[PDB]
Amino acid sequence: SMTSHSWLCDGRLLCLHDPSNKNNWKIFRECWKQGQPVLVSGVHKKLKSELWKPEAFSQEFGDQDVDLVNCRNCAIISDVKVRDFWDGFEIICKRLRSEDGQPMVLKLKDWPPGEDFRDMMPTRFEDLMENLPLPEYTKRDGRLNLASRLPSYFVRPDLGPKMYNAYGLITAEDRRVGTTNLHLDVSDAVNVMVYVGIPIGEGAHDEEVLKTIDEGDADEVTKERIHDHKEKPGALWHIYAAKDAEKIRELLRKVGEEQGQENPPDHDPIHDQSWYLDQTLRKRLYEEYGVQGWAIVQFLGDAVFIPAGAPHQVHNLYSCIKVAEDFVSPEHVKHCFRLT
Ligand SMILES: CN1C(=S)S[C@@H](NO)C1(C)C
Ligand SMILES: [Cl-]
Ligand SMILES: [Cl-]
Ligand SMILES: [Cl-]
Ligand SMILES: [Cl-]
Ligand SMILES: [Mn+2]
After folding, report:
1. Is the CB–ligand 1 distance for residue 44 below 6 Å?
2. Ligand with smallest separation from the Cα of 137
3. Which of 183, 242, 276, 303 could connect to 40 by a Cys-Cys bridge, CB 3.0–4.6 Å?
């Protein structure tokens, strides 16, 4: 039967099933006030699927100049054409190669650039903004979005949305690498998975994806979405409560020291955006500091709600197109205040 919601992470994560249900706020606001992330499924079914394809981005915008990042070593690939990224998104035989002659796992940096999404892609902008879930929180002018209503004593988010485009991580070695390293934002955010590209050529990399989800600490109900319903998994997230941010900083200062980094005792390893918590580091966080997080698999059309101040990291399983919008909920406005 169709139901309003279900639970993941063994009851610790709300999963809303109908993105446009006018009663979602009633269930949402109880979990959100406690500092929890929330998942909303089915957003892909609300969108115009032809506007979110890698081949369309390449055809319409392919002559723009951009920088890429090599996800394996953080090397920057400067001043290439954006088609050089899009044409290898699913076809592995078309990817830019490293010296070792392997196809690279690439992230497209800052594209569209700064606040230019709405100017560059007005039709995509409309399709996304009109179908965001929890619209009183997430729309630019929603009644529960304080972004447009706050004085300069608060850090205000940039005008969005922002697009996040990157290939999937492939190998056993890749399991310890991030697509986006551990960091935090002083605003709330909603992150929507609008396209998942399962590649071809080196296409059969399905079994390393299962070992990554399993070692990533995903719950048994999350594993049933693949095996029983054949949904497409895009990315593995780990999210931590805002109240645990300082304990994470203490762990990363101890590890930086053990690895012979030479860091002042007060430096901020979360703001530096230099760490990915692999299986070894997640277990140490739990055992040595008492900190548990949420392991979330974001499938096609899942919207991940990330609370202000909550540390988080992202590991692409397959090639992903994500679009995210920032907002300022009244529950979490304390995180962007500039005093005490
Ligand atoms: C989030 N979620 C479950 S858990 S099962 C899956 N149906 O395949 C649905 C209802 C979308
Ligand atoms: Cl909070
Ligand atoms: Cl457009
Ligand atoms: Cl709402
Ligand atoms: Cl990063
Ligand atoms: Mn973020």
Report:
1. no
2. 4
3. 303
Is residue 183 marked as binding?
A: yes
Q: What is the resolution of this structure in A?
A: 1.6
CA 264 to CA 253: how far, in whole Å?
Answer: 9
Q: Which CATH architecture has domain 1-340?
A: Sandwich (2.60)
Using a CB cutoff of 8 Å and minimum separation of 24, what contacts does 248-253 make? 248/182, 248/285, 248/289, 248/291, 248/311, 250/289, 251/281, 251/284, 251/285, 251/288, 251/289
User: The tokens 């055992």 sit on which residue?
Assistant: 287
Alpha carbon distance 37, 135 (integer Å): 16
Residue 36 C-alpha to ligand 2 middle, in angstroms?
9
Cβ 176 vs Cβ 328: under 8 Å: no
Encode burial over 316-338: b for 16+ CB neighbours within 10 A, e otherwise: bbbbbbbbbbbbbbebbbebbee
133 upstream amide cis, omega within 30 of 0:
no
CA of 225 to the centre of ligand 1 (A): 6
User: In angstroms, rounded to a whole number, what is the distance separating the alpha carbons of residues 283 and 217?
Assistant: 10
Is 127 marked as binding a ligand? Answer: no
Type of residue at 196:
V
- Pocket of ligand 1 contains residue 221 by CB under 6 Å: yes
Gyration radius (Cα) of the chain, Å: 20
Q: Whose CA is nearest to atom 5 of ligand 1?
A: 225
**CA–CA dist 44, 136 (Å, integer):** 20
Answer for the pair 254, 161: CB distance below 8 angstroms, yes or no.
no
69 with 75: CB under 8 angstroms?
A: yes
- Measure the CA–CA gap between 241 and 146, rounded to whole angstroms: 22
Q: Note the Cα 261 to chain centre separation in Å.
A: 28
What technique solved it? X-ray
339: helix, strand or coil: coil
CA 38 to centroid of ligand 2, rounded, Å: 14
Give the SS3 label for residue 273: coil
